[PDB]
Design an enzyme around this catalytic site. Sequence first.
Site: not given
Length: 435
Positions: A21, A51-52, A135, A180, A330-331
């Site tokens: 975060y 990442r987004h 996102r 993903d 994604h992370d």
Amino acid sequence: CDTVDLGYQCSPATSHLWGQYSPFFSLEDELSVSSKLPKDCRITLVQVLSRHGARYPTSSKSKKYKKLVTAIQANATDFKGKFAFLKTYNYTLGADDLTPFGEQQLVNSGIKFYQRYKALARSVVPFIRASGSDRVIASGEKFIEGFQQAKLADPGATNRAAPAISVIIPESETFNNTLDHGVCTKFEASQLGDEVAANFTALFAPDIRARAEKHLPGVTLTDEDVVSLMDMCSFDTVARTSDASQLSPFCQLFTHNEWKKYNYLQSLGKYYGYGAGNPLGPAQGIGFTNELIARLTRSPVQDHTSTNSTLVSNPATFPLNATMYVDFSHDNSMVSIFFALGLYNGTEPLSRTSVESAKELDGYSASWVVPFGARAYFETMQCKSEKEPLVRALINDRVVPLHGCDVDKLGRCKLNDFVKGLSWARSGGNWGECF
Ligand SMILES: *[C@@H]1O[C@H](CO)[C@@H](O)[C@H](O)[C@H]1NC(C)=O
Ligand SMILES: *[C@@H]1O[C@H](CO)[C@@H](O)[C@H](O)[C@H]1NC(C)=O
Ligand SMILES: *[C@@H]1O[C@H](CO)[C@@H](O)[C@H](O)[C@H]1NC(C)=O
Ligand SMILES: *[C@@H]1O[C@H](CO)[C@@H](O)[C@H](O)[C@H]1NC(C)=O
């Protein structure tokens, strides 16, 4: 607060300790050599894995947080000291979407990519894919916005057609998506990451729980609510202004030493959930690793894991000669990918009981590796000093020395040597254990 070159640098003693975060911050020269293009070298290929950007909580988390803030505001007979703002705090966060700040991080990332690879970008329209999450796609669109902004501002640009996102890889439990996870049955059932995180949370949350309840008489909190209130520091900061110029009042509820513990909690989550800590962690990143090998060597994909054979063996959805590739993900998948590539093979299993810093762990932490707007660059270069192409990996601007091959003083390997080292991914790892 946020810049193209360096990422997010407001209140960095706090904002760099939010694990995944944290807004991207540059790690140039952190336990690393210079990320500059070496003398007499020319970039010949670059893969970007992004990442987004900064987002709202996922809808399930945003519901959990709103419920917690509502409960606190219902139950507290006083809101004391640093908690006083909880009196009038209005929970206004949405769900899932990028925030204005997170959109701008991706615009900045696109600019940064154009600027760092200008000599190639001048003539190249990148080939771009995005995992099928709003996102993530929106992140791709914003990256493209920034890349074109920089390109159209460059008098030396020759090939100025905007790239489209050519492939939106569906996200589901049945679709083989390298950006993903979802198809590895046993892994998706895994609880190790959550178990490790709950265990470590039980070590550090109680003292915080005590102090917060002391300031919120009437309120009862769980260990999880403590983590929720800490998550709110980042989410509120990245939503409350368009430029994330103002740290959230949730942030100073917690001390610096507590933020170190939180940041570590996040590192444990990723390591034991998606990294080498999970027995099937790195296997989630084999698919993309094999895609990257295919791109670096301009050769058909050899993979039996999470690639889609119809996506990869068709030039339209998987070209082998694009020179610039950009993939949005994604992370969690990015963690598995980086481990599958062996980039954190210098990192030992994380202490489940004791904080270890990113530097103790040889550059691994959630905030160093998968912040909001994280980016990895995988370069091929041709240098006057060497006949063979040289490969270099940069993770959030840190040169991450390669593993599995004889690395030089600049953290590079010869292309064939690097590929030779990726024997684990090339042979499908322990993917069979998925079933
Ligand atoms: C592979 O992709 C094609 C085309 O999008 C789709 O029809 C097929 O279901 C996919 N298979 C898997 C398992 O991903
Ligand atoms: C959590 O801690 C307990 C008690 O020390 C231990 O038995 C258990 O193995 C730990 N869980 C994990 C997944 O490390
Ligand atoms: C999807 O992945 C699994 C490997 O886990 C494989 O059995 C199947 O062939 C794949 N299908 C496609 C379309 O690639
Ligand atoms: C990283 O370490 C694992 C475990 O020793 C090994 O199987 C893998 O091949 C290594 N990867 C690289 C690229 O060296």
